[PDB]
């Protein structure tokens, strides 16, 4: 039971926040990438566990740039946006609003990277602030280490949140 409906998700964020690493994580390295563009396939079971279950082959696109470098020719037919910020760089979170303007009804997900580089002391403060940040985009938030494959393991809280986001992208479209 495989769906042929297109689902295109853009991965946006400042240079170096972890976008390519995140695409590799979320797609289990089913990724084709080069200096210009990176696309991954994230296989997603929509409404899993019901007679309505269908498998979707979601595209995750990472084309880089900066909010001067514009890649708008890659922003066509987008159904959802993952906004990526580096939890050790507060400036990368301030730029998510501008990134979102490069492309309302399009669902958004906010993902913070490099959680492993935040000490248990300063962690509570960063996470309170990222909850507020996600609220600004009417979005759920996931904070993780992109280099740890357990970060989005099947059945984890993070995976449930990502799955909820993909379900919404499919429904809105």
Binding-site residue positions: 16-21, 114-116, 145-146
CA torsion sign, 78 to 84 to 90 to 91?
negative
Q: How far apart are CA 165 and CA 136, in angstroms?
A: 16
Q: Kindly report the CA angle at 153 between 94 and 99, in degrees rounded to 5? A: 20
Q: Nearer Cβ to ligand GSP, position 21 or 54?
A: 21
Work out how close the CB of 133 gets to ligand GSP at its nearest, in angstroms, rounded to a whole number.
17
CA dist., res. 77 & res. 74, Å (int) = 9
Give me the least distance between CB of 116 and ligand GSP, in Å please.
Answer: 5
Is residue 40 a contact partner of residue 23, using CB atoms and an 8 Å limit? yes
| Binding at 21: pick from Mg ion, ligand GSP, none (beta carbon under 5-8 Å per type) | ligand GSP
Q: Which residues are paired to 112 by β-bridges?
A: 85, 143
Closer CB to ligand GSP, residue 79 or residue 143?
143
**In the complex, residue closest to Mg ion by CB:** 20
Closer to ligand GSP by CB, 23 or 139: give it: 23
**Are 81 and 103 in contact, with CB atoms under 8 Å apart?**
yes
Q: Which residues would be at the binding site for ligand GSP (CB under 6 A)? A: 15-21, 64, 113-114, 116-117, 145-147
Tell me which of 20, 88, 158, 163 binds Mg ion, using CB under 5 A. 20
Tokens of 135: 């609220």
**Residue 113's binding partner out of ligand GSP, Mg ion, none, with CB under 5 to 8 Å set by partner kind:** ligand GSP
Instruction: Please provide the distance, in angstroms rounded to a whole number, between the alpha carbons at the two ends of the chain.
Output: 19
Q: Which residues bind Mg ion (CB under 5 A)?
A: 19-20, 62, 64
């Amino acid at each position: 039971f495989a769906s042929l409906d297109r689902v295109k998700v853009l991965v946006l964020g400042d240079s170096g926040v972890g976008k390519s690493s995140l695409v590799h994580l979320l797609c289990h390295n089913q990724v084709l990438g080069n200096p210009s563009w990176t696309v991954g396939c994230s296989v997603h079971d929509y409404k899993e566990g019901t007679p309505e279950e269908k498998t979707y082959y979601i595209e995750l696109w990472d084309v880089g740039g900066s909010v001067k470098s514009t890649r708008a020719v890659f922003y066509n037919s987008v159904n959802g946006i993952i906004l990526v910020h580096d939890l050790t760089n507060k400036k990368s979170s301030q730029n998510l609003y501008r990134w979102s303007l490069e492309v309302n009804q399009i669902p958004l997900l906010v993902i913070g990277t490099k959680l492993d580089q935040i000490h248990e002391t300063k962690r509570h403060e960063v996470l309170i602030r990222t909850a507020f940040l996600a609220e600004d985009f009417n979005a759920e938030e996931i904070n993780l280490d992109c280099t740890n494959p357990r970060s989005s393991a099947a059945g984890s809280s993070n995976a449930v949140k990502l799955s909820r986001f993909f379900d919404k992208v499919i429904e809105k479209r």
